[PDB]
Amino acid sequence: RNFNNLTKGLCTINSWHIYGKDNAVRIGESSDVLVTREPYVSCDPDECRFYALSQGTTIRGKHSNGTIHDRSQYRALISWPLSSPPTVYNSRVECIGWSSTSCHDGKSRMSICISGPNNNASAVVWYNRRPVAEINTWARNILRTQESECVCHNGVCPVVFTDGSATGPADTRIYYFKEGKILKWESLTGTAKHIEECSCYGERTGITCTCKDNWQGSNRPVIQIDPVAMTHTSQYICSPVLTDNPRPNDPNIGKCNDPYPGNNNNGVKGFSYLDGANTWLGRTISTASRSGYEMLKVPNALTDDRSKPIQGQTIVLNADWSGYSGSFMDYWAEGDCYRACFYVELIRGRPKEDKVWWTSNSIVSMCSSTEFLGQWNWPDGAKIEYFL
Amino acid sequence: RNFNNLTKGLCTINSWHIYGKDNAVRIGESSDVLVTREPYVSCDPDECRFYALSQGTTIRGKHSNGTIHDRSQYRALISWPLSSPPTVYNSRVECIGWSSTSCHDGKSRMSICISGPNNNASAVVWYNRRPVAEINTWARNILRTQESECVCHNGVCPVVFTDGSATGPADTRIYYFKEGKILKWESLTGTAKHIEECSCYGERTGITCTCKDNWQGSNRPVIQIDPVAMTHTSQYICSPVLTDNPRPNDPNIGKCNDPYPGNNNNGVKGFSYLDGANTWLGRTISTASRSGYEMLKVPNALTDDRSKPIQGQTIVLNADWSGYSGSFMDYWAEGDCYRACFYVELIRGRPKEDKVWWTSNSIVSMCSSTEFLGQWNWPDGAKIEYFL
Amino acid sequence: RNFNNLTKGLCTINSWHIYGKDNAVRIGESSDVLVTREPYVSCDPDECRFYALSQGTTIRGKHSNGTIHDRSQYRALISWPLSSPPTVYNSRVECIGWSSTSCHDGKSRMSICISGPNNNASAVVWYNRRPVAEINTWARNILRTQESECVCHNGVCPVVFTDGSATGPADTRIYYFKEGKILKWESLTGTAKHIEECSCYGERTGITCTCKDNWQGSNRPVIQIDPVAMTHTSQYICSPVLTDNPRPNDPNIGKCNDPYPGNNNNGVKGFSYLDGANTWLGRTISTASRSGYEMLKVPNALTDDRSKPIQGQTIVLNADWSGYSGSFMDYWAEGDCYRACFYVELIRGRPKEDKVWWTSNSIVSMCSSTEFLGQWNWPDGAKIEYFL
Amino acid sequence: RNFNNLTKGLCTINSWHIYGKDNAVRIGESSDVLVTREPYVSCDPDECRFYALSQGTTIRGKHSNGTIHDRSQYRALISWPLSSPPTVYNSRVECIGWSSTSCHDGKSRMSICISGPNNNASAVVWYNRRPVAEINTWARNILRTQESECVCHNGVCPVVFTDGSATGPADTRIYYFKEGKILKWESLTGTAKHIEECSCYGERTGITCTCKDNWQGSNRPVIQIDPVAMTHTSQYICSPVLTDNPRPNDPNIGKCNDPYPGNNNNGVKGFSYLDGANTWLGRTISTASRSGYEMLKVPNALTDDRSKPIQGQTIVLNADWSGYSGSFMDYWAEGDCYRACFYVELIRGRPKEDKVWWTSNSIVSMCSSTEFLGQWNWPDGAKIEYFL
Ligand SMILES: *[C@@H]1O[C@H](CO)[C@@H](O[C@@H]2O[C@H](CO)[C@@H](O[C@@H]3O[C@H](CO[C@H]4O[C@H](CO[C@H]5O[C@H](CO)[C@@H](O)[C@H](O)[C@@H]5O)[C@@H](O)[C@H](O[C@H]5O[C@H](CO)[C@@H](O)[C@H](O)[C@@H]5O)[C@@H]4O)[C@@H](O)[C@H](O[C@H]4O[C@H](CO)[C@@H](O)[C@H](O)[C@@H]4O[C@H]4O[C@H](CO)[C@@H](O)[C@H](O)[C@@H]4O[C@H]4O[C@H](CO)[C@@H](O)[C@H](O)[C@@H]4O)[C@@H]3O)[C@H](O)[C@H]2NC(C)=O)[C@H](O)[C@H]1NC(C)=O
Ligand SMILES: *[C@@H]1O[C@H](CO)[C@@H](O[C@@H]2O[C@H](CO)[C@@H](O[C@@H]3O[C@H](CO[C@H]4O[C@H](CO[C@H]5O[C@H](CO)[C@@H](O)[C@H](O)[C@@H]5O)[C@@H](O)[C@H](O[C@H]5O[C@H](CO)[C@@H](O)[C@H](O)[C@@H]5O)[C@@H]4O)[C@@H](O)[C@H](O[C@H]4O[C@H](CO)[C@@H](O)[C@H](O)[C@@H]4O[C@H]4O[C@H](CO)[C@@H](O)[C@H](O)[C@@H]4O[C@H]4O[C@H](CO)[C@@H](O)[C@H](O)[C@@H]4O)[C@@H]3O)[C@H](O)[C@H]2NC(C)=O)[C@H](O)[C@H]1NC(C)=O
Ligand SMILES: *[C@@H]1O[C@H](CO)[C@@H](O[C@@H]2O[C@H](CO)[C@@H](O[C@@H]3O[C@H](CO[C@H]4O[C@H](CO[C@H]5O[C@H](CO)[C@@H](O)[C@H](O)[C@@H]5O)[C@@H](O)[C@H](O[C@H]5O[C@H](CO)[C@@H](O)[C@H](O)[C@@H]5O)[C@@H]4O)[C@@H](O)[C@H](O[C@H]4O[C@H](CO)[C@@H](O)[C@H](O)[C@@H]4O[C@H]4O[C@H](CO)[C@@H](O)[C@H](O)[C@@H]4O[C@H]4O[C@H](CO)[C@@H](O)[C@H](O)[C@@H]4O)[C@@H]3O)[C@H](O)[C@H]2NC(C)=O)[C@H](O)[C@H]1NC(C)=O
Ligand SMILES: *[C@@H]1O[C@H](CO)[C@@H](O[C@@H]2O[C@H](CO)[C@@H](O[C@@H]3O[C@H](CO[C@H]4O[C@H](CO[C@H]5O[C@H](CO)[C@@H](O)[C@H](O)[C@@H]5O)[C@@H](O)[C@H](O[C@H]5O[C@H](CO)[C@@H](O)[C@H](O)[C@@H]5O)[C@@H]4O)[C@@H](O)[C@H](O[C@H]4O[C@H](CO)[C@@H](O)[C@H](O)[C@@H]4O[C@H]4O[C@H](CO)[C@@H](O)[C@H](O)[C@@H]4O[C@H]4O[C@H](CO)[C@@H](O)[C@H](O)[C@@H]4O)[C@@H]3O)[C@H](O)[C@H]2NC(C)=O)[C@H](O)[C@H]1NC(C)=O
Ligand SMILES: COCCNC(=O)O[C@@H]([C@@H]1OC(C(=O)O)=C[C@H](NC(=N)N)[C@H]1NC(C)=O)[C@H](O)CO
Ligand SMILES: COCCNC(=O)O[C@@H]([C@@H]1OC(C(=O)O)=C[C@H](NC(=N)N)[C@H]1NC(C)=O)[C@H](O)CO
Ligand SMILES: [Ca+2]
Ligand SMILES: [Ca+2]
Ligand SMILES: [Ca+2]
Ligand SMILES: [Ca+2]
């Protein structure tokens, strides 16, 4: 085995096809399915798997009561087979904590979990299923990271962290790991003003991360990372097609170097694929809440502050709950291009559905097609009444 | 590993022996067994497994209510170990959708799932557990495929699709895949007038598919495919031993080139082994409904429009529910011949048993013997009253 | 991998140590544990596993009602990891039927299952998880075999079958298989007058099988098989230490060449290790029913019709239910000798405990020690009241 | 594969990071989780796993009633994947009994289980999943061993046993095994006056075991073993920082060569890392009961009878129940040093929580960091009321 190198460009994205769906909440109505949230997907050279933060209880279990809470000692990053649900019996624990990232470098997998109280959190970096390095909180205010997969090049895997205020200036760092060891870290530079929960992908041009501005922005900040020089830059998606949630209505001029205003102290993890005319943006359909999901083809969205959609695809109807979304790719697939993929978290339970006392989710996932495929919509599919 | 070649003829079929049975509904009365339908069986070089379309819920789960429905977003092709039941914890998801086929080419497995709304469905072709090619609906009317295994020769795996009316002329295509990539497709030729749900097997003479005519026919259409030239022909089984369901009584002259009339707009997936004097036909015992199952030795059934049974074997009593049936073989077994095999879907629940609100099934499977073995009958075995 | 050869003698048996115990009924009170009976143990070169005939239902499942019945279509030979219980999710189906044997030859495993109605049963011989040969009933009266492991030498694995009356003269055959193919079979010769459910083991002197006489005998018939010449002889254990159940009290003169009388038309599967002064016999403690279990050191028991115990060990108290017992050894263990092992079936439920409507069992297993170890007793451990 | 050699020293311990946590009782409220106690952790060259003594029943199972009892026939040493809970379906049985140890020597794993009545117990030594050697009770009074992992050097794995009184002088032996075979054993020498449940680790200086004095001592006895010479010495931890439970308050002068008095006929399994200025001691926070857990940096604690803490870390709040604790390390990790690790048993149920009728536990585990990481606390997390 050799370290994977990012030698390919993105495949042409003409539509999106169904990749995976686990129907976790449906199945969990009568099965030992773990309560989760903050899911994602990540590939090894020989297998792709679902990931999520467990809440250390099943949905039918009485301990599901209160799982709207974000940061307990009973949480852990788990992985399980593609499109299976996360069950007590098929879930592999990667590490313990309530914020995570994970990625394979071609030889072995790095996984990172953050745990601890708000003012005293720490990250533990696992490599090849062993703890290798540790990072203590530097701002004493909820040290947190991506909640989706990281990306590697020639053994080097960058990861974005944030420590500090959720509602003001914070201390964001980009760490560069190799075999779990810290090669270098640097403070955030560029014009992004607040950074959380970056969704990343790699291609021959480097590594691209689409994050969340939780402070003042409803446009998404972008961090572009050179994994060889181990340097980065940041800005926002220039496009007036805004992709945070909640968010204002789409203007006709976006912002490249500053937060687009209207919604403060909130946001949702999201993603994009920024690739010239091959650019696609994901967002919730609702501007008010985490419902619905759509992909929009927005040429040069990253750099064009006038750019508008020329094509689209509905993934989840606005009538259905969505949630977090993020990027991943199978870097070990055959062919001459990397096929763009993403997942959407379909949150069920609280706060929006409070007849139950739990909060969980299921997963739906799509990858790009060079065909122009017909579209469906993909609801979680569970009936809340069944849980009462 | 090399691509498998179809170098052997069928073993002499003198009777049928029990190969597998999962008792899924019995066990699912008190276990986390997934609701399924449209099952089949397919072999890898080192393992044979059961396959089926899950409904994304267990039988005891409250979401089992309404699983008579064919095409939800909660369906997926799953596989699980031979004669185990399809449980939440032992089922491997092959792809997402509500119509499927799957086969191993000697090196890796190709799986195909179709999903989407009726007027906008698409097929995704997986190879070695990765999505490789996609096919959009060409007639905008429930793009659908075999619901049993495909067959490969030297890397080339043909698959029969249909798009269009279930009750009139439709657009049937034969696709030729290699490592999941589309080599060629062609429109249906020959005298078959309607094609659905082909059951296929391969032998030195080529690949033989026995399908269903859902429009006007109660004799079964046959497609014969040359996987090297990548060409095909079609007709019907000439025999007056009719093997669709529902169906008229057996006449004394069959039809080779046209549907045998009497029953319109219905049918059941079925199969046959067409091999000169070594020919055996499968069918439900009832002419009215999906109950019972029998094998009949009908010499030259394919080409002889007068051919009658000279030997038989009951598989399922008429008193017991059956359903779909299809062909598979272990192409990687030892010996000088391919041993013919088949499965029978044993449907329980709706519409025939409507005291419950679900529809599911279990599997029974037989392979041929050169001995003349005593016969048993093989019911699903579950008591519906237990589910009330 | 090479075929295993029987090149060692038995280890000196000075006592018995605990080898395995699955506590299946205890655990099955609240878990998806399959109803079983007729268990045994058998080793691969890299793993030893528990085996049993499932009833195709869990204990808590409503279909457990009526599992006192011996021969349904819902039975199958299953295997599962050593001392785990047989669960829906961890059990591997070896073949379908209601009477079985199984053994590894050093390269691959042969498994045999018999299914069918009483007058039309057939055996299917699997090798390396594929069906290879089939045998039709020759006496049309419950074709049946060992219900414990077979033994192989240089690829040749003998198996004892019986077809015919349970209460009179029957047709017993010894089959010789290699890679699942039938090399030879022969009719029973020697002085044994009725043969069922042989328990076998192999050592440098050949293969020794201790069986059950269900007709007139309460001494156990013995079949000694030369796996190279593929020939055999038979007699009874000469010892007056009688080891069937039910049975008369121990006399002072046994019978070598005829059934020891007193109990007709009944018996229990059992075993022995016949090795000169290193001879140990297993039996139920009760003479009336399947309760208790003990090992007795009886020098030259096979050939000495006066032989008596000089040492012993209680395995199960008479107050506790037992059942079938049989022999197995790890032929792939290190060292200069084969360590004798056995299992005892601990039957719970009907007919003896009829407040429940099911019949199942758990397993306890011991292997020999060259030490003189202290003894314990090993009950099933489940409380029937919990199931009411 | 080669035998592992202890060629490294301990990593510098500046704090402790979360390594694993299974939340077994939380999950077991609604899942098939086995009742356990006496857990530990142990690594293979390619995997680290949780271990414990099962009680042969799930927590929700009715047979959980009475599991406060220590030594039934329904107990077994089981192992399961790191931070998964011990479920019926994912637990591997290592051997049968109610006292155990286990360790990998670099080539294969040795596991030892003791079973039997109080006056007639015996140990069975398994190697590479096969029984290899047996040891009969030598004092006829509850033969018992470590309840945490053993340690190997060049194939030689020492294990500490005790047979005899829990409340007076007993017969302690150190056994030296290789590939499960007994190389040598010796009676306890040195100044330790009573020995139970040793927690061991290995480093270039040899093998160090921290045990429990159940008779008169509240300081912990230490056994230091040379695995090459196969000899040992014993004393107590000299430090006045006392680490048994229950225990007196910390004095200012400890005892090196005798039990520190105040508490008789009780104790808890515990551990330490004794490494000059890099020394850390574990103990319950409460002096009265098994509640809370803390690590204390106590320079030269082993040899300095005046030594006091200069740094610490809370692991479990005093308000939360703890229990046994023990040492393990990943001897197959990369780097130039062995990273110290430990687990804490979090006991729930009886005797302290007697509204339920069971006794079980979950596991939390930490490894050392060279960083000075912020601390959290790690409760079991289950609510007893949910079980009523
Ligand atoms: C079977 O499946 C297939 C495959 O999926 C289905 O075909 C798909 O159908 C869907 C639905 O119609 C399409 O998605 C939409 O795409 C449009 C973009 O395409 C249109 O516009 C293009 C650009 O036109 C402009 O530029 C060109 C440049 O040359 C210029 O020529 C033109 O005059 C104009 O200036 C056109 O090129 C394009 O034409 C092409 O495609 C046609 C088919 O689509 C074809 O007929 C033509 O011949 C030609 O080939 C086409 O006209 C997206 O704009 C649209 O997304 C908007 O609308 C949805 C609601 O449907 C909304 O959710 C989106 O967010 C977005 O609307 C918001 O954002 C806008 C941008 O900021 C804003 O302006 C809007 O007002 C709106 O804003 C409001 O809502 C949001 C969300 O809540 C909120 O945040 C805001 O604040 C505000 O409140 C769809 O994505 C697929 O492209 C199409 N795919 C294919 C391959 O055809 C087929 O229908 C299915 N069949 C059946 C029977 O069902
Ligand atoms: C232990 O197990 C063994 C092994 O399984 C059991 O032995 C088996 O027993 C079964 C049951 O009897 C047999 O299955 C039947 O086979 C017959 C065919 O065999 C008969 O016919 C042969 C052909 O005869 C013709 O041609 C020859 C050519 O030379 C000529 O000589 C002859 O005069 C005649 O012209 C004979 O060769 C054959 O004889 C041989 O076998 C005998 C044993 O079977 C033996 O005794 C002889 O010595 C000789 O060796 C034999 O006579 C099938 O025809 C039959 O299938 C029909 O019947 C079942 C109902 O049982 C039905 O479900 C089938 O669908 C079919 O009937 C329908 O289709 C016909 C064709 O269209 C139609 O004509 C019928 O009217 C009927 O149609 C109606 O029903 C269908 C279904 O609902 C509906 O769709 C229609 O519209 C309409 O309503 C059986 O398959 C096995 O072959 C046999 N196996 C062996 C190895 O022996 C044994 O019994 C068990 N033991 C015990 C104690 O239980
Ligand atoms: C800790 O654990 C250890 C290790 O397990 C325990 O030690 C074990 O203790 C058990 C229980 O006592 C022993 O099992 C019994 O063994 C005897 C055989 O040993 C005795 O007999 C030997 C033979 O004596 C004869 O021959 C010699 C030849 O030289 C001659 O010298 C002698 O005079 C006589 O002629 C003796 O050699 C032997 O002495 C040796 O061992 C002694 C310790 O055992 C030691 O003290 C001596 O110094 C010497 O070293 C000893 O005297 C078995 O006979 C016995 O089995 C019978 O009894 C049980 C009931 O307990 C019964 O279930 C059996 O079926 C059997 O009884 C039936 O069968 C007989 C034969 O047909 C029949 O005659 C009986 O009437 C009876 O029949 C009735 O019941 C059956 C069953 O229902 C029914 O079918 C019939 O029809 C009828 O109704 C036990 O197996 C272990 O051997 C022993 N192991 C060791 C290593 O010591 C220790 O006790 C534990 N410690 C504590 C504190 O618990
Ligand atoms: C974010 O996380 C970080 C990282 O975890 C947190 O920082 C940690 O904070 C904890 C809690 O404070 C610390 O644990 C305690 O450590 C002390 C030891 O450190 C103190 O003492 C050192 C030694 O001082 C002596 O020697 C030096 C030698 O030169 C001499 O200079 C000095 O004058 C004195 O003679 C000092 O060196 C040390 O200073 C250093 O550290 C300071 C920060 O801690 C820093 O500010 C300084 O600048 C300097 O760098 C410091 O003063 C342990 O003693 C203590 O353990 C005792 O207390 C706990 C209760 O908290 C108790 O459970 C323990 O068992 C123990 O107390 C018992 O045992 C004693 C010994 O026998 C006995 O004397 C006591 O009376 C007591 O006995 C009673 O209770 C027990 C238990 O029930 C019973 O058995 C007895 O019988 C009796 O009833 C803690 O372990 C960490 O060290 C610290 N880590 C780091 C890296 O800083 C941070 O707080 C978090 N942030 C937030 C916002 O929460
Ligand atoms: C008016 O009818 C239009 C919709 N009906 C339809 O398509 O039914 C078809 C199949 O029928 C059955 C069956 O049991 O009869 C089960 C399959 N279910 C699957 N999920 N695969 C069906 N195939 C599909 C793609 O749904 C039938 O062959 C007619 O075309
Ligand atoms: C009068 O007492 C005689 C019986 N008590 C006894 O043996 O308790 C011992 C251990 O205690 C505890 C505990 O939690 O304190 C849990 C262990 N349980 C296991 N199943 N291993 C016990 N070990 C055994 C072999 O039972 C103790 O160390 C005294 O010797
Ligand atoms: Ca925002
Ligand atoms: Ca039809
Ligand atoms: Ca008898
Ligand atoms: Ca003590």
UniProtKB/TrEMBL annotation, chains A, B, C, D:
PTM characteristics: N-glycosylated.
Keyword Cell membrane: no
UniProt activity-regulation remark: Inhibited by the neuraminidase inhibitors zanamivir (Relenza) and oseltamivir (Tamiflu). These drugs interfere with the release of progeny virus from infected cells and are effective against all influenza strains. Resistance to neuraminidase inhibitors is quite rare.
Active-site positions on this chain: 70, 324
Residues linked to a glycan: 5, 65
Broad enzyme group: hydrolase
Gene Ontology terms, MF aspect: exo-alpha-sialidase activity; metal ion binding
Catalysed reaction, written as an equation: Hydrolysis of alpha-(2->3)-, alpha-(2->6)-, alpha-(2->8)- glycosidic linkages of terminal sialic acid residues in oligosaccharides, glycoproteins, glycolipids, colominic acid and synthetic substrates
Cysteines paired by S-S bonds: 11-337, 43-48, 95-113, 103-150, 152-157, 198-211, 200-209, 238-256, 341-367
Record keywords, A-Z: Calcium, Disulfide bond, Glycoprotein, Glycosidase, Host cell membrane, Host membrane, Hydrolase, Membrane, Metal-binding, Signal-anchor, Transmembrane, Transmembrane helix, Virion
GO biological process annotation, one example: viral budding from plasma membrane
GO cellular component, one term: membrane
Positions that bind Ca(2+): 213, 217, 244, 266
Region annotated Head of neuraminidase, chain positions: 10-388
CC cofactor: Ca(2+)
Source organism superkingdom: Viruses
Membrane topology summary: Single-pass type II membrane protein
Subcellular localization, as worded in the UniProt entry: Host membrane; Virion membrane; Host apical cell membrane
Binding-site positions, substrate: 37, 71, 196-197, 212, 290
Reported function: Catalyzes the removal of terminal sialic acid residues from viral and cellular glycoconjugates. Cleaves off the terminal sialic acids on the glycosylated HA during virus budding to facilitate virus release. Additionally helps virus spread through the circulation by further removing sialic acids from the cell surface. These cleavages prevent self-aggregation and ensure the efficient spread of the progeny virus from cell to cell. Otherwise, infection would be limited to one round of replication.
Subunit-level organization: Homotetramer.
Homology family: Belongs to the glycosyl hydrolase 34 family.
Entry remark concerning the domains of this protein: Intact N-terminus is essential for virion morphogenesis. Possess two apical sorting signals, one in the ectodomain, which is likely to be a glycan, and the other in the transmembrane domain. The transmembrane domain also plays a role in lipid raft association.
This protein's name: Neuraminidase
Species of provenance: Influenza A virus
Source lineage: Viruses, Riboviria, Orthornavirae, Negarnaviricota, Polyploviricotina
Range of the intact protein held here: 78 to 465 of 465
